[PDB]
Amino acid sequence: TSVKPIFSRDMNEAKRRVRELYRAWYREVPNTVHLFQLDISVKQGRDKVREMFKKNAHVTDPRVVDLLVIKGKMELEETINVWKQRTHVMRFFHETEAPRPKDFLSKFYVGHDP
Amino acid sequence: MSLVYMNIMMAFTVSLTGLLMYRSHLMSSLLCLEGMMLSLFILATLMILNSHFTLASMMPIILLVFAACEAALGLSLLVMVSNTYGTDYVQNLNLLQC
Amino acid sequence: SRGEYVVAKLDDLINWARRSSLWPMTFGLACCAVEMMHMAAPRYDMDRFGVVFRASPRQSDVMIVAGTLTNKMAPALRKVYDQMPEPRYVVSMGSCANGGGYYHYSYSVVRGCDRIVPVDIYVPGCPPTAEALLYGILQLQKKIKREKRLRIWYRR
Amino acid sequence: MNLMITLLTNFTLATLLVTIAFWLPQLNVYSEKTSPDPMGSARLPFSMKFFLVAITFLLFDLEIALLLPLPWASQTTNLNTMLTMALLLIFLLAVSLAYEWTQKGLEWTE
Amino acid sequence: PLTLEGIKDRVLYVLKLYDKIDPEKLSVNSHFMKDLGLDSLDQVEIIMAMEDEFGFEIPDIDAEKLMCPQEIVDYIADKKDV
Numbered sequence: 334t335s336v337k338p339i340f341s342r343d344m345n346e347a348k349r350r351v352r353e354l355y356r357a358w359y360r361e362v363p364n365t366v367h368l369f370q371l372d373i374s375v376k377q378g379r380d381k382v383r384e385m386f387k388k389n390a391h392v393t394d395p396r397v398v399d400l401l402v403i404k405g406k407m408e409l410e411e412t413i414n415v416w417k418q419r420t421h422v423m424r425f426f427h428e429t430e431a432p433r434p435k436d437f438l439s440k441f442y443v444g445h446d447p
Numbered sequence: 448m449s450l451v452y453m454n455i456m457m458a459f460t461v462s463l464t465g466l467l468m469y470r471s472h473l474m475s476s477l478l479c480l481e482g483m484m485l486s487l488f489i490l491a492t493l494m495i496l497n498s499h500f501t502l503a504s505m506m507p508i509i510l511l512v513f514a515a516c517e518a519a520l521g522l523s524l525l526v527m528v529s530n531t532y533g534t535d536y537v538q539n540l541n542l543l544q545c
Numbered sequence: 546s547r548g549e550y551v552v553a554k555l556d557d558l559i560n561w562a563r564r565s566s567l568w569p570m571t572f573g574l575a576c577c578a579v580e581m582m583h584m585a586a587p588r589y590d591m592d593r594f595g596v597v598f599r600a601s602p603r604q605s606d607v608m609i610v611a612g613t614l615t616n617k618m619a620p621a622l623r624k625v626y627d628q629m630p631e632p633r634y635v636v637s638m639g640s641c642a643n644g645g646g647y648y649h650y651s652y653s654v655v656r657g658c659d660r661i662v663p664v665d666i667y668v669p670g671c672p673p674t675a676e677a678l679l680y681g682i683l684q685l686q687k688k689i690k691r692e693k694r695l696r697i698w699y700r701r
Numbered sequence: 702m703n704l705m706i707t708l709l710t711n712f713t714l715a716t717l718l719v720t721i722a723f724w725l726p727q728l729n730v731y732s733e734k735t736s737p738d739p740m741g742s743a744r745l746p747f748s749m750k751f752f753l754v755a756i757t758f759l760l761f762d763l764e765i766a767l768l769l770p771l772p773w774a775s776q777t778t779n780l781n782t783m784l785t786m787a788l789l790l791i792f793l794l795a796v797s798l799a800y801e802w803t804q805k806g807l808e809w810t811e
Numbered sequence: 812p813l814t815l816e817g818i819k820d821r822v823l824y825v826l827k828l829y830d831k832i833d834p835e836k837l838s839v840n841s842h843f844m845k846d847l848g849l850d851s852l853d854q855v856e857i858i859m860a861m862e863d864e865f866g867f868e869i870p871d872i873d874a875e876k877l878m879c880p881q882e883i884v885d886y887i888a889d890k891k892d893v
């Protein structure tokens with residue numbers, strides 16, 4: 334079970350790197366809303382950043398959250414540098430996708446997927 | 448005297464009051480300075496032609512050449528100011544208050 | 546009547562001007578751009594039809610999607626198309642621009658540029674020949690020849 | 702008078718064709734579009750070198766302004782002085798170009 | 812930034828602008844995790860709001876140990892004079 338780390342020895346340094354990535358995204362949201370001239374607000378974008386950080390809130394492996402920090406920094410550098418267009422930022426906001434049936438009964442009504 | 452001389456002097460004084468009242472830009476100050484030069488050129492030409500004074504026909508060319516070199520000097524000063532501060536705004540030029 | 550004959554002759558005039566002065570953009574993507582260069586080459590020679598390649602899409606009249614459209618470039622294609630003045634036209638050249646082609650089931654390919662831009666002529670092939678692409682351009686000229694813009698403007 | 706008529710006619714034809722170009726295809730309604738570059742949004746950095754070649758143009762244009770009465774000045778009765786000052790002005794334009802040369806002013810737009 | 816009482820009132824004003832916190836239960840010794848019931852990221856954006864108003868950077872190692880407004884005003888007071 335003795336593996337080789339990526340950057341973090343344990344989960345404390347891992348949470349430190351996660352926390353610095355979240356600080357960078359929190360600072361970068363208003364500049365992203367301005368220089369991409371999005372139709373979203375800053376609080377709404379920061380809530381989406383909070384939703385994307387809390388989506389992976391259950392991992393207790395240092396290597397997996399190190400790779401999540403690395404992929405989040407790749408998203409971050411592609412957002413800071415003007416490499417994404419408006420569409421690559423607005424794909425986090427699944428706006429054209431209609432809200433799917435949530436409970437049992439409506440998914441029973443609309444089809445076969447569980 | 449002649450009526451057009453009033454207009455050329457009034458254009459000189461309007462460009463004066465433009466130079467003597469800055470708004471924001473230093474390029475506008477240089478443009479007011481060269482409007483002053485332009486009115487001086489026209490007024491010198493009208494005098495020298497109305498006199499039939501032949502030897503001073505070369506004088507407005509000398510005025511234009513010396514004050515265009517003066518304008519190039521001022522444009523270079525403006526360029527160095529706008530390299531220091533990013534803009535040529537005159538409110539950036541107040542570090543010599545103290 | 547008089548006004549309908551007037552707008553019919555003006556429709557023939559403006560449609561003649563539009564079909565006989567097509568300016569495509571020099572916007573290739575893939576293998577189809579090679580055969581589109583061959584349609585610019587001396588044998589088939591688009592230039593004798595009034596058809597010249599232009600670099601900026603502002604002075605362009607028809608966007609020839611010559612090649613495979615990927616997911617990474619579909620907003621670039623849509624933005625280039627949006628930079629064109631109207632009337633602008635789209636010619637889809639080859640199978641990947643038409644429906645996705647040889648890379649139809651791929652993760653990174655748009656399955657036809659008609660998901661992105663309104664295609665007017667679908668030129669089929671892999672690649673379609675320069676004779677076939679010039680056939681598609683002549684069919685586009687026939688399509689612009691039968692537009693009825695001022696007749697509908699008079700009769701609306 | 703004939704010059705003013707010709708200037709007014711040429712200016713009128715220019716403004717007439719610009720009126721036809723900005724109002725006859727603007728009779729179209731076509732469609733309410735939005736249209737939502739190498740530099741994206743950042744400020745254009747100043748180029749010292751383009752300004753220096755513009756100032757070099759201005760100073761050589763003033764030296765040209767000195768050189769322009771030479772076909773009239775060839776008619777003079779003081780020809781030795783005129784030839785001396787003419788060669789001296791073209792020499793001063795050449796020395797201005799030489800100082801622009803040797804002090805690296807003609808580099809990267811040579 | 813001059814007096815300690817103004818720094819404490821400005822800490823509490825940054826906290827009462829922060830709309831997630833109930834201002835009734837807010838005290839000087841209120842705990843973010845168990846009294847205020849806030850997530851960790853909520854504390855992180857509180858620290859960044861403290862930097863938005865107080866204007867000096869805080870490292871991550873000594874921002875994790877700031878679990879009340881009293882610890883925040885003590886950390887501000889340690890990095891300044893008062």
Ligand SMILES: C=C(C)[C@H]1Cc2c(ccc3c2O[C@@H]2COc4cc(OC)c(OC)cc4[C@@H]2C3=O)O1
Nearest residue numbers: 571572573574575576578579581582585598612
């Ligand atoms: C301008 C004329 C007369 C010819 C040459 C030409 C076209 C049309 C389109 C293009 C083009 O050349 C440029 C440069 O060379 C290639 C080479 C390519 O592949 C070898 C390639 O593939 C997409 C694309 C290109 C450009 C392209 O889009 O018509």
Ligand code: SF4
Nearest residue numbers: 576577639640641672
């Ligand atoms: S349709 Fe085929 S030959 Fe044509 S560009 Fe696509 S892959 Fe190449």
